[PDB]
Paper text:
With the exception of α-hemolysin, which is homo-heptameric, leukotoxins are bipartite toxins, formed by the non-covalent association of two distinct proteins, a class S and a class F component of approximately 31 and 34 kDa, respectively, into a likely octameric species. Panton-Valentine leukocidin (PVL) is associated with necrotizing skin infections, such as boils, and plays an important role in the poor prognosis of necrotizing pneumonia. Since the binding of LukS-PV to the membrane is a saturable process, the necessary presence of a LukS-PV receptor on the cell surface was thus proposed. This was recently confirmed by Spaan et al. who showed that the C5a receptor is required for the binding of LukS-PV to human neutrophils.
The T244A, Y246A and N248A mutated proteins crystallized in identical conditions (50% PEG 200, 0.1 M MES-NaOH, pH 7.50). Residues R73, H245, Y246 and N248 are specific to the two proteins, whereas Y184 of LukS-PV is replaced by a histidine residue in HlgC.
Author numbering: 2 to 122, 126 to 284
Write the structure that this text describes.
């Protein structure tokens, strides 16, 4: 069963939708939890956005050269949610503020009568939903928000390198130790020195709660966007008088923006059925 009783005259109807795109290298695992409460004057839906966004980190030689090689990597991950229904309002979302901690763990609590809150380090609520994601060396913040939308940016922040502390904008970030190699991968730091968000990808965990005016319409559409913004780091071999060789990085910041996989979902407030309307 996917209907749980949260109190007297209150229940949560649970539904899940799963979609993947080889085109974008994204998996969207969406949880739709319908809040059915007699003591609450509105229809409510808790959306838990999970899945996977591949880093799509690629290493390649620069043109017809042997001494310039490149690394294309995700500077920022994009997580967005929007609605086109005038009768639907975005009431809350998690995370709400700029957060730089390695693990982002937050809880949304629900109490009968339409009361929504956030839990610390515990329950006691009638119903609750929890987010958990790792963002090592990255920072999360809300880029854009209103009553119909919320957009997050999980961007490169601070790194501990062999040359000391580096920002996500440092041109020498990720530059390797093998200038005489012919493999573009060797011009860049090994995977054990790369954060998971660069070597593998991102495992999102985001929450958004929407309120629908009762009887205003049976259906509502939601667009969920998962993607990334790519940077290109070029590592040129040098050359010094003494004879020793080293690598030097130059950067094309925001070389490939909004490499996003957008899925349009249809929700039925009466039957609690989910339909995938379309995608890209």
């Amino acid at each position: 069963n996917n209907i749980e009783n949260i109190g007297d005259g209150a229940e949560v109807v649970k539904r899940t939708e799963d979609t993947s795109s080889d085109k974008w290298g994204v998996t969207q695992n969406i949880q739709f939890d319908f809040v059915k409460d007699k003591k609450y004057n509105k229809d409510a839906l808790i959306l838990k956005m999970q899945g996977f966004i591949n880093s799509k980190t690629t290493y390649y030689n620069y043109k017809n050269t042997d001494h310039i090689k490149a690394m294309r990597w995700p500077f920022q991950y994009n997580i967005g949610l929007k609605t086109n229904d005038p009768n639907v309002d975005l009431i809350n979302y998690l995370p709400k503020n700029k957060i730089d901690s390695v693990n982002v763990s937050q809880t949304l609590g629900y109490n009968i009568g339409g009361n929504f809150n956030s839990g610390p380090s515990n329950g006691s609520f009638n119903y609750s939903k929890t987010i958990s994601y790792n963002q090592q060396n990255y920072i999360s913040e809300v880029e854009h928000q209103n009553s119909k939308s919320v957009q997050w940016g999980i961007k490169a922040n601070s790194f501990i390198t062999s040359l000391g502390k580096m920002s996500g904008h440092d041109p020498n970030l990720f530059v390797g130790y093998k200038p005489y190699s012919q493999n573009p991968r060797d011009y860049f730091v090994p995977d054990n020195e790369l954060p998971p968000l660069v070597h593998s990808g991102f495992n999102p965990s985001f929450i958004a709660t929407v309120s629908h005016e009762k009887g205003s319409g049976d259906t509502s559409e939601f667009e969920i966007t998962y993607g990334r913004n790519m940077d290109v780091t070029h590592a040129t071999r040098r050359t010094t008088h003494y004879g020793a060789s080293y690598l030097e990085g130059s950067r094309i910041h925001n070389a490939f923006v909004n490499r996003n996989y957008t899925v349009k979902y249809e929700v039925n407030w009466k039957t609690h059925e989910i339909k995938v309307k379309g995608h890209n």
